[PDB]
């Protein structure tokens, strides 16, 4: 366009982009700042950084860039490079891994009244204080704090477009749910500098994690092994395989502990409930191994060296087996030949007595296993019901 | 300063930074090149890349940038942006994952006689030939080949500033120890450009690895698990746990070998001594498992289907036990009469069969004592040799 | 040449590349947008982005770049650096990184009629929403959305590119056989192109290119499915072992640990979204739960086998079910010295008879265990076969539609 060529030549012929767009140095530039969230790229819980794809809409008036439409063939709007005009130096205060300011100098829209709209894109990698205490049923609240860097509130003023960031074209995450989003403007006064207020706009988003992936991939196998933990008490000692089962459960839990500790950040501000519950399950398994070692020792107790104490006999044979209703427990040379038969009969009697005492020991071990099985099943079911305030079983 | 402003305006007025700084085109620029190693950032053994933080000191004379200090208030030195003057095009020939030339265009010191001092920083990611023969006690020798790219030796000449790189401000690595470092100048003819010689300076650093991370994390558990191999032979067959122990040791050893594999490049130039020794240890462990299975099979040999050959009885029962010293080894009444006689005959047969079974068990016991003694001999000679 | 230099001096004497070419105020520039795919590099399911090597075929008309060839020694077209002329800010809108613009700025081709064609190359990384339900037997629908970042429908009019003989529009991604590398993991099923508007925004218009790609699941089959099939076979086998062997727990627990390890290592390659569970993960969970039940029932069988009259009394229902009814169905049917010596013989005979009765009752318990174990074997074989076949038959009948719908 010839008219637009002449107009662009006239607009920038004596225009200094270093100078603020005010008619008097006393006045301030009024900038309307709107944040549009396009996509939540990631939430890095370990590194505590949230990456978002945004557009930073900024509107202000530049009276040096106005013209009469009748003098230019009726042109009312033109597109100008953002590098040609004065721009606000809007900086993300809580930047963690990206750029502080806008780096994609896209074109801007200029009206004949001097009104400018500029909506550059950005990838904001902001710091996010991750609250890993209800993982993976946690909700996150972390923000993006925007402000003019080198100008105070008396030189450049920023105001939000609306109370909330724009999520009209937001792309659904699949890992997080936007519960709430809001934008608050703040006036900050420092004791150094009473006459200069410092403006700031903070946008915050409430993210609710969708827990299905972590549930299926982590929690269910942990629950499976935790439930198999108490099954060692139904395994008879004569099988000689209790240690195999118990230790295998322990090894699986230590592998899953490795997985969990590589899942979450290493901050000690709050103890994750998943880590605490995993430690509790490990204590559970260790106590199970200890008490099943005690049971194995009791089962193989030799009657020759150990005699059953009377209290043990009373407790584990006279009163407890009656309690369990659901169990199926039970509650010349002819002389030499003569003394040979004598000896055989006497040895069989001694063998019978020793076997009876050994069977008493085995019965005591069996009763201990039944008590432990009932207790451990009850504990496991109560525990699995009461985790994450029951949100696991509710899911 | 007004004097310095006028001086800089005057120096770069008719200056053309495309031309070489020579009075006559037949002369050559002499550039004193010095390397200063600030930090050995990393040594990537798998990828064979060494990343260092260096400062590349370069000196030459530009006769076009002379001035009289008396005419400019006694100014004798100024600082100029590198982009304003002619610079040598030094290139790291063996660049691998970085920049060939200097990218940090810092300011350079210009003297009133025309002498120029320029020490830009750089991150050199050079290619390094990793010799894994003695890992993790290996020393590495890999270099930095720097030369002028587009100018031959008759136009731009480079000379080393010192015989060695400058490591005065070197940050200690914590993984490597600089044993030796030196810089050599070479005259090279390339197929591209066979008429004239191209100059280069090669800086090499002899760095010795500190073997504590890998001794603790790799070697020590490997020794712990390989020592458990000999315990299988002292374990009696009646325990029912020989195979469990031997197989667990084998699995742990193969896991550690696979971990070792991940710490070295996939090059087939040389086999690491650690890898070869782990392979030999696995071969020994598997042979021990073979002999353990043979011992277990022998211990349970039924005399009904197996009779001990004379060549076994003569050697394993009469020869070795006398040799090995440190061990502590070695009407209807007639029916009743016929029944008791049958019982006595059955005791005959059972006692004889049990005697043969005990002979087989004794053979198995002497076999695994022999193997245990062999293992102890290997362990003793190995620990004496290493010391 | 000298004449080309004269033509360039004449053309760009007052040409401003910042101004959209509109000969009269209100005119719209027609921009034809096409895409050529040279290589589908990656479809990263973890971060949900697609990396492609593409040519962006753009064509428009600039009335300011017009000349008469007869006045310039018959020059009919020029190659001009792309920065010297106005171009529309045609960018990939749904990029995953911050890269909106092209990578390679090739010369534009300007004809004497003002027609400007531009084919820059780029390495685009565009966000793709992965549907994880049928992974790894899945097909994906990855889109590339192109539009002018600056100008709206009031300033430019996006259209489809033309073919070599410029008579018909090409409403699809162009693939050149001479320059195209097959991915080897994805096969392209459909590659249509379409223009999209928004009913709530009359100034919006883009050209979207769709890549309907189907995964080739051989890698996942070989490295995950067959090993888990062997593990499930072992989990069925554990019910054929006799309880006396002492290796029932070893087999069942080893199978469980193996399948758990396979699940953990496969959790690396699957996407981390929580909208659905992939068919491979569902199969792994089914196998893991089946092996856990195998462990539980093996423990139960071992407990039954090791009972004795000194400890348990067989209830009536166990005897009725496992001794009498099931085995037919399962085909698993089964001188004072003389006086004292006489007394000693009496004692020995009584001991032998008592031991025989005790052994008979123990044998009854062991037979109950054997029958229950055989029943578990049949039940687990049936469940494993049916579940595995059902899951993989469901996964097999997942193909992209014949109509791309776009």
């Amino acid at each position: 366009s010839e008219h637009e060529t002449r107009l662009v030549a006239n607009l920038l012929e004596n225009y200094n982009k270093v100078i603020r767009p005010v008619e008097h140095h006393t006045h301030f530039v009024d900038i309307t700042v709107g944040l549009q969230l396009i996509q939540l790229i990631s939430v890095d819980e370990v590194n505590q950084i949230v990456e978002t794809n945004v557009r930073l809409r900024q509107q202000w008036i530049d009276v040096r860039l106005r013209w009469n439409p009748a003098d230019y063939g009726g042109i009312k709007k033109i597109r100008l490079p953002s590098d040609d005009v004065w721009l606000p130096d809007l900086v993300l205060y809580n930047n963690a891994d990206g750029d502080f300011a806008i780096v994609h100098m896209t074109k801007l829209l200029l009206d004949y009244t001097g009104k400018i709209m500029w909506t550059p894109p950005a990838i904001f990698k902001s710091y996010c204080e991750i609250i890993v205490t209800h993982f993976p049923f946690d909700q996150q609240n972390c923000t993006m704090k925007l402000g003019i860097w080198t100008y105070d509130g008396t030189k450049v003023s920023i105001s939000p477009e609306s109370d909330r960031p724009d999520l009209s074209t937001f792309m659904e995450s699949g890992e997080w749910v936007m519960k709430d989003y809001r934008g608050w403007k703040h006036w900050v006064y420092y004791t150094c500098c009473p006459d200069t207020p410092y403006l700031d706009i903070t946008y915050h988003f409430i993210m609710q994690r969708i827990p299905l992936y972590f549930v299926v991939n982590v929690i269910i196998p942990c629950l499976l092994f935790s439930f198999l933990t108490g099954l060692v008490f139904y395994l008879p000692t004569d099988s000689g395989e209790k240690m195999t089962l118990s230790i295998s459960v322990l090894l699986s839990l230590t592998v899953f502990l490795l997985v969990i500790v590589e899942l979450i950040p290493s901050t000690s501000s709050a103890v994750p409930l998943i880590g605490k519950y995993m430690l509790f399950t490990m204590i559970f398994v260790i106590s199970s191994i200890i008490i099943t070692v005690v049971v194995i020792n009791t089962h193989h107790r030799s009657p020759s060296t150990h005699t059953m104490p009377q209290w043990v006999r009373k407790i584990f044979i006279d009163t407890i087996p009656n309690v369990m209703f659901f169990s199926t427990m039970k509650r010349p040379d002819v002389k030499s030949a003569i003394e040979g038969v004598k000896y055989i009969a006497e040895h069989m009697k001694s063998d019978e007595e020793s076997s009876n005492a050994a069977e008493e020991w085995k019965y005591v071990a069996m009763v201990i296993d039944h008590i432990l099985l009932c207790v451990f099943m009850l504990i496991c079911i109560i525990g699995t019901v009461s985790v994450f305030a029951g949100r696991l079983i509710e899911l | 300063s007004e004097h310095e402003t006028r001086l800089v305006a005057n120096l770069l007025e008719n200056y053309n930074k495309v031309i070489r700084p020579v009075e006559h085109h037949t002369h050559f620029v002499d550039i004193t090149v010095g390397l200063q190693l600030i930090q050995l950032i990393s040594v990537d053994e798998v990828n064979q890349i060494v990343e260092t933080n260096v400062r590349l000191r370069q000196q030459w004379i530009d006769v076009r940038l002379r001035w009289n200090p008396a005419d400019y208030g006694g100014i004798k030195k100024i600082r100029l942006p590198s982009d304003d003057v002619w610079l040598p095009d030094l290139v790291l020939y063996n660049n691998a994952d970085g920049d060939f030339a200097i990218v940090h265009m810092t300011k350079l010191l210009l003297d009133y006689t025309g002498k120029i001092m320029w020490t830009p920083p750089a991150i050199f990611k050079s290619y390094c030939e990793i010799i894994v023969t003695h890992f993790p006690f290996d020393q590495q020798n890999c270099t930095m080949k720097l030369g002028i790219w587009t100018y031959d030796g008759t136009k731009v000449s480079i000379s080393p500033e010192s015989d060695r790189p400058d490591l005065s401000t070197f940050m200690e690595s914590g993984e490597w120890v600089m044993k030796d470092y030196r810089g050599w100048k070479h005259w090279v003819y390339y197929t591209c450009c066979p008429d004239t010689p191209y100059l280069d300076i090669t800086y090499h650093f002899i760095m010795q690895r500190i073997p504590l991370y890998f001794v603790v994390n790799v070697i020590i558990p490997c020794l712990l698990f390989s020592f458990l191999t000999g315990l299988v032979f002292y374990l009696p067959t009646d325990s029912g746990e020989k195979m469990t122990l031997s197989i667990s040791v084998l699995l742990s050893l193969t896991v550690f070998l696979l971990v070792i594999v991940e710490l070295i490049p996939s090059t087939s130039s040389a086999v690491p001594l650690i890898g070869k020794y782990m392979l030999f240890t696995m071969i020994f462990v598997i042979s021990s498992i073979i002999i353990t299975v043979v011992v277990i099979n022998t211990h349970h040999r039924s005399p009904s289907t197996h009779t001990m050959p004379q060549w076994v009885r003569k050697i394993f029962i009469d020869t070795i036990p006398n040799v090995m010293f440190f061990s502590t080894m070695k009407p209807d009444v007639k029916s009743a009469i016929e029944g008791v006689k049958y019982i006595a005959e059955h005791m005959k047969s059972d006692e004889e069969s049990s005697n043969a079974a005990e002979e087989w068990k004794y053979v198995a016991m002497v076999i695994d004592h022999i193997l245990l003694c062999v293992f102890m001999l290997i362990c003793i000679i190995g620990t004496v040799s290493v010391f | 040449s000298v004449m080309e230099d004269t033509l360039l001096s004449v053309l760009f004497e007052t040409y401003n590349p910042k101004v959209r070419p509109a000969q009269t105020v209100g005119d719209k520039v027609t921009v034809r947008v096409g895409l050529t795919l040279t290589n589908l590099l990656i479809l990263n399911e973890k971060i949900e982005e697609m990396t492609t090597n593409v040519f962006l075929n753009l064509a428009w008309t600039d009335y300011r770049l017009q000349w008469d060839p007869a006045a310039y020694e018959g020059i009919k077209d020029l190659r001009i650096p792309s920065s010297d002329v106005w171009q529309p800010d045609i960018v990939l809108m749904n990029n995953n990184d911050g890269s909106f613009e092209i990578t390679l700025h090739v010369n534009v081709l300007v004809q004497h009629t003002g027609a400007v064609s531009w084919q820059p190359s780029a390495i685009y990384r565009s966000s793709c929403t992965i549907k994880v339900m049928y992974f790894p037997f899945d097909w994906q629908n990855c889109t590339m959305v192109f539009k002018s970042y600056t100008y709206d429908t009031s300033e430019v009019t996006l259209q489809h590119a033309l073919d070599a003989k410029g008579e018909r529009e090409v409403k699809e991604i162009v693939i050149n056989k001479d320059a195209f590398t097959e991915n080897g993991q994805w096969s392209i099923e459909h590659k249509p192109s379409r223009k999209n508007w928004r009913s709530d925004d009359p100034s919006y218009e883009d050209v979207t290119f769709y890549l309907i790609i189907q995964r080739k699941p051989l890698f996942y089959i070989v490295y995950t499915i067959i090993p888990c099939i062997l593990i499930s076979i072992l989990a069925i086998l554990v019910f054929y072992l006799p309880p006396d062997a002492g290796e029932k727990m070893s087999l069942s627990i080893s199978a469980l640990l193996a399948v758990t390890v396979f699940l953990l290592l496969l959790a690396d390659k699957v996407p981390e979204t929580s909208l659905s569970v992939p068919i491979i993960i569902r199969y792994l969970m089914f196998i893991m739960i089946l092996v856990a039940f195998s462990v539980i029932l093996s423990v139960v069988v071992l407990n039954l086998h090791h009972r004795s009259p000194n400890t348990h009394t067989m209830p009536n229902w166990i005897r009725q079910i496992f001794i009498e009814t099931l085995p037919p169905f399962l085909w698993i049917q089964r001188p004072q010295d003389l006086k004292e010596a006489v007394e000693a013989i009496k004692y020995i005979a009584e001991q032998l008879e008592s031991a025989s009765e005790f052994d008979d009752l123990k044998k009854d318990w062991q037979y109950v265990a054997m029958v229950a174990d055989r029943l578990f074997l049949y039940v687990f074989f049936v469940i494993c076969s049916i579940g595995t076949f059902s899951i993989f038959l469901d996964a097999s009948h997942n193909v992209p539609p014949d109509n791309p719908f776009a």
Binding site: - | T267, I290, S335 | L8, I75, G184, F219
Partner: protein, 425 residues
């Protein structure tokens, strides 16, 4: 310095336009002589299917505007100019992986008084290389670097392989140049062939930029000693342990544990192998095929050990030893497999008769149990003799088929030319 005057005359006085082709007439064509020097084969990442190379791109063309009379100036026979002051051809690597199309360092060009411009910039190129995993780790790959001219069509510039002189006759340089003074030999990959071809696609037109290219090929063979020592040997040994597990007696109680542990180790090796290859479905790798076969065979071994254990623990109380199985596994097979081999008196009489009867019944029961033991021993001996030869023959066949895999000694099957530096055509 007369170089300043010469450069000012060439670039400023003559009004050198950097954006115009070096042709005296618009219908002429610029000839670009192109060659590649490989200084280091940095890596070949199979998972990423990327080849990283350290190369020197050699360009040579004629610019009639950069000609001067060497006698009018001082005897200046050569000149160095930055590439941003003169016209250079934009030759790009079309099949790159990252967004790096051009060279890394824009070094000076060299100009002669007759206008012969030479440009030798270094570059790090990351190209796409499809990986043929069929014979891994005994495989060879065929990587290529395809260079196109996207700034001008085939009617405006013509790409060519650079020529060379040996005795006054010109021959094209139809290979990648390897300078012994500037080449480092990769420890993992050995270069077998390295041809260069100028390809024309007649289905396209000289109208555009897809009509021509220059491609440099690189047929490289992997050195498999590393993988043979570190991956294949432990797997083979652990696999052989499975067949050895048939020799353990059933009374030991460790047959199943041994076989299962072998299977688990094989699974670990399979997973680690999976970690090292791209997820392509063109073929299953040779080591992958061996691992799958060996895991299937070890599962068969586990099943058959379970069957042997089931047979060993049978009793007359639950099972009957039929004549068919008795004669099959106790008569025929052991020979085929060459396997080894006043009322007090009456009460006392009644009690001892009862004792004798019970002892006789116990002896018969033990005899039946021993027969079942012998049946189990025959079964697992037959199992060993059947499965261990299959195992060893399969291992040998698989790992000999891979070792008999070589590059075809001539690239471009239909072309008899060797494309080697020692015999130009």
């Amino acid at each position: 310095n007369e170089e300043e005057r010469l450069i000012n005359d060439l670039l400023i006085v003559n009004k050198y336009n950097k954006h115009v082709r070096p042709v005296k007439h618009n219908n002429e064509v610029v000839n670009i002589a192109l060659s590649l020097t490989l200084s280091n084969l940095i890596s070949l990442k199979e998972t990423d299917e990327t080849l990283t190379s350290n190369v020197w791109m050699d360009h040579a063309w004629y610019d009639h505007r950069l000609t001067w009379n060497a006698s009018e100036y001082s005897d200046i026979s050569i000149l160095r100019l930055p590439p941003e002051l003169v016209w250079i051809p934009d030759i790009v690597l079309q099949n790159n992986n990252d967004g790096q199309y051009h060279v890394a360092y824009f070094c000076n060009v060299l100009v002669r008084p007759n206008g012969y411009v030479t440009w030798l910039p270094p570059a790090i190129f990351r190209s796409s290389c499809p990986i043929n995993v069929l014979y891994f780790p005994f495989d060879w790959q065929n990587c290529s670097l395809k260079f196109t001219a996207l700034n001008y069509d085939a009617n405006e510039i013509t790409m060519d392989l650079m020529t060379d002189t040996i005795d006054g006759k010109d021959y094209p340089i139809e290979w990648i140049i390897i300078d012994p003074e500037a080449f480092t030999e990769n420890g993992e990959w050995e270069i077998i062939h390295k041809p260069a071809k100028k390809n024309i696609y007649p289905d396209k037109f000289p109208n555009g930029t897809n009509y021509q290219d220059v491609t440099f090929y690189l047929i490289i063979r992997r050195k498999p000693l590393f993988y043979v020592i570190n991956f294949i040997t432990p797997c083979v040994l652990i696999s052989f342990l499975a067949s050895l597990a048939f020799y353990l007696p059933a009374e030991s109680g460790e047959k199943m544990s041994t076989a299962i542990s072998v299977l688990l180790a094989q699974a670990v090796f399979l997973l680690l192998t999976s970690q090292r290859l791209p997820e392509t479905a063109l073929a299953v790798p040779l080591i992958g095929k061996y691992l799958m076969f060996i895991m299937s065979l070890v599962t068969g071994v586990i099943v058959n050990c379970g069957i042997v254990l089931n047979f060993h623990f049978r009793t007359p109380s639950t099972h009957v030893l039929s004549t068919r199985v008795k004669q099959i596994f106790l008569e025929k097979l052991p020979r085929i497999l060459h396997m080894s081999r006043h009322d007090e008196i009456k009460s006392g009489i009644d009690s001892t008769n009862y004792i004798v009867k019970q002892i006789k019944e116990k002896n018969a029961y033990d005899e039946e149990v021993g027969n079942w033991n012998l049946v189990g021993q025959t079964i697992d001996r037959l199992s060993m003799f059947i499965i261990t030869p299959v195992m060893v023959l399969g291992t040998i066949f698989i790992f000999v088929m891979g070792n008999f895999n070589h590059p075809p000694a001539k690239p471009f099957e239909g072309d008899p030319f060797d494309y080697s530096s020692d015999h130009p055509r």
